[PDB]
Amino acid sequence: AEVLVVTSKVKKLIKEKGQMNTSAETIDVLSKAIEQLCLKGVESAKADGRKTVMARDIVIDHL
Amino acid sequence: AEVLVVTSKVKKLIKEKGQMNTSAETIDVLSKAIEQLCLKGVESAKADGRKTVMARDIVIDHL
Amino acid sequence: AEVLVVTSKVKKLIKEKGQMNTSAETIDVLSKAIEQLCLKGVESAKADGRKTVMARDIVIDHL
Amino acid sequence: AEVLVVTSKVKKLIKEKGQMNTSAETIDVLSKAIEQLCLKGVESAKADGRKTVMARDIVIDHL
Amino acid sequence: AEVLVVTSKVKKLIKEKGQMNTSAETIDVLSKAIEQLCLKGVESAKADGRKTVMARDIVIDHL
Amino acid sequence: AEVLVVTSKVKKLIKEKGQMNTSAETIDVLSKAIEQLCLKGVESAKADGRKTVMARDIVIDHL
Amino acid sequence: AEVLVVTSKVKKLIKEKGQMNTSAETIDVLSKAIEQLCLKGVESAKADGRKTVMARDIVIDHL
Amino acid sequence: AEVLVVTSKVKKLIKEKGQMNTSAETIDVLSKAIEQLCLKGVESAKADGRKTVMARDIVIDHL
């Protein structure tokens, strides 16, 4: 259930910017990264008493 | 540019798992996170001498 | 009998310079071009009474 | 740089079909002709919207 | 020019019947055997004043 | 069963080099000759303790 | 630390009996199966107050 | 026949992790377990249409 990335555009980016192919399992791991980022965003909004996940709730300072 | 996440499923997961809405720019920064994961993947693959970004090249331990 | 081009290096050139794949039948047509160029080189050397095909005998002014 | 022709078979074809030797730089310019055919092939494929250099993209009618 | 054997089916036969791999140069030698067999078949038909190579013109009594 | 020769190129070589046609069963027996060469190749490789049928295992001196 | 299967003989068995290749990660999973079987054998001997793992302590009734 | 486990490391793991000795036929049945896992792996791969026994073909959930 639920693939959260747009496969064709991810592949195009990796081909265009990196001159590489993309494994199918790569798409799966990226989808799981999105899942984890949204779950943390929801916990970050709830800890602030808001009802909307905002860009500031998406934490990528470890990126 | 370029939306790399499936917006409808991101919103559906956030509403279904946290009851919240999803701001517009949340999609934007989720997409930026994908771009960065993909570009690190290309660097990981290049350092392995490979031409394919594989699951092993996408590290999401910090998320 | 006789493939006259170095397949792996032709493919690498097209991938590197053109960001493209190479069909197997492409290698065949390039080999036939080499065959035609050598046959004309031999006729060009013979018309000059020489026993050696030289660079000047390889005509690519139609290129 | 980069030799794109199979030198031993080029020499063997020239000796076997014309009884002649093959100068060193004959290989060099045969290789240059390959580079040019490949680069025109990439342009032909791009104008077709393709990502693969195919036999149809290598025109050797003038040779 | 001209590979006269069907590579994939030759490899399958050697793998299936002999439990072995097949070198690429093996395919070349088999193609040359076919070339020699057809050239002799043409000489055998011509010596009989026929215009068609037939099975009887393919001599493998030395096999 | 199994056609092991490239019929179109066999016919083209026979018409181009001898001006003749090629009967149907000529292909069949050419294919049988391939089967026999391959099976002798497997025996040659086995007697060398190898697992790969190589050019050295295909003897076509008698043809 | 510790590869518990004899790689070359496992590969030979799969090639001989199954006519197949063996992935390197296959050897790893088999080693882990051996590790799990010995750990259970030790618990089975201890539960009987013995100091020696015996064949009867190696349980493969789920096999 | 054929010992498929590394006896010295099996014994060392059993002595180091349980302080016990290892009977002779324990090695024998550990080896039989390997044979059976490999033969099920071949069946799993065949049902996938593959020619390689991979990690996915070795199921050790029941152990």
H1 contact residues in G (CB cutoff 8 A): none
Chain D: residue whose CA lies nearest to C51: D20
Answer whether E25 sits within 8 Å of F55, measured CB to CB.
yes
Query: Best residue in E37, E57, E59 to probe F by mutation, most F CBs within 10 Å?
Result: E37
How many contacts (CB atoms, under 8 Å) link C and D? 148
Element (H, E) at F22: strand F21-22
Measured in angstroms, the CA of C8 and the nearest CA of chain E are apart by: 14
Measured in angstroms, the CA of B1 and the nearest CA of chain A are apart by: 11
Burial E10-38 (b: 16+ CB within 10 A, else e): bbebbeeebebebbeebbbbbbbbbbebb
Amino acid symbol at F22:
T
- G49 secondary structure, DSSP code: T
Please indicate if any CB of chain C lies within 8 Å of the CB of D38.
yes
Is the CB of residue E45 less than 8 Å from the CB of residue F14?
Answer: no
Please indicate if any CB of chain E lies within 8 Å of the CB of F39.
yes
* Out of D13, D17, D53, closest to residue C18 by CB: D53
- H61 secondary structure, DSSP code: S
Is the CB of residue A26 less than 8 Å from the CB of residue B55?
Answer: yes
DSSP state string for H9-44: HHHHHHHHHH--EE-HHHHHHHHHHHHHHHHHHHHH
DSSP state string for C30-53: HHHHHHHHHHHHHHHHHTTT-SEE
Q: How many whole angstroms separate alpha carbon A25 and alpha carbon H21?
A: 44
Q: Do chains C and F touch (3 or more CB pairs under 8 A)?
A: no
G20 contact residues in H (CB cutoff 8 A): 42, 45, 50-53
Q: Give the Cβ contact number of residue B13 at 10 Å.
A: 20
C45 contact residues in D (CB cutoff 8 A): 18, 20
Q: Which of residues 8-37 of E touch C (CB under 8 A)?
A: 28, 31-32, 35
Element (H, E) at A53: strand A52-53
Answer whether G18 sits within 8 Å of H34, measured CB to CB.
no
Chain G: residue whose CA lies nearest to H22: G53
Q: How many whole angstroms separate alpha carbon F45 and alpha carbon H40?
A: 31
Distances (CA, A) of E51 to B30, C2, E41: 73, 28, 11
Q: Give the Cβ contact number of residue H60 at 10 Å.
A: 15
Give CB contacts under 8 A, 24+ apart, made by D38-46. D38/C10, D38/C13, D38/C14, D38/C17, D38/C18, D38/C30, D39/C17, D39/C18, D41/C14, D41/C18, D41/C26, D42/C14, D42/C17, D42/C18, D42/C20, D45/C18, D45/C20, D46/C18
Measured in angstroms, the CA of H11 and the nearest CA of chain G are apart by: 9
Answer whether H34 sits within 8 Å of G39, measured CB to CB.
no
Answer whether E35 sits within 8 Å of C2, measured CB to CB.
no
Radius of gyration of chain F (CA): 14
The experimental resolution of this structure, in angstroms, equals 2.0
> Which of A22, B2, F19, G12 minimizes the C-alpha distance to H2?
G12
User: Does residue G52 sit in helix, strand or coil?
Assistant: strand
Burial F25-63 (b: 16+ CB within 10 A, else e): ebbbbbbbbbeebbeebbebbeeeeeeebbeebbeeeeb
Kindly state the greatest CA–CA separation across chain B: 45
Q: How many whole angstroms separate alpha carbon E39 and alpha carbon A42?
A: 78
Residue position matching structure tokens 């499936």: B6
E39 contact residues in F (CB cutoff 8 A): 17-18
CB-based contacts of C31: which residues, under 8 Å, 6+ apart?
C2, C3, C4, C5, E1
Answer whether C34 sits within 8 Å of D39, measured CB to CB.
no
Query: Best residue in C15, C30, C51, C57 to probe D by mutation, most D CBs within 10 Å?
Result: C30
Please indicate if any CB of chain A lies within 8 Å of the CB of B2.
yes
CB-based contacts of C4: which residues, under 8 Å, 6+ apart?
C30, C31, C34, C35, D5, D6, D9, D10, D13
Chain G: residue whose CA lies nearest to H32: G60
E28 contact residues in F (CB cutoff 8 A): 55
E1 contact residues in C (CB cutoff 8 A): 1-2, 28, 31-32, 35
Q: How many whole angstroms separate alpha carbon A36 and alpha carbon F7?
A: 58
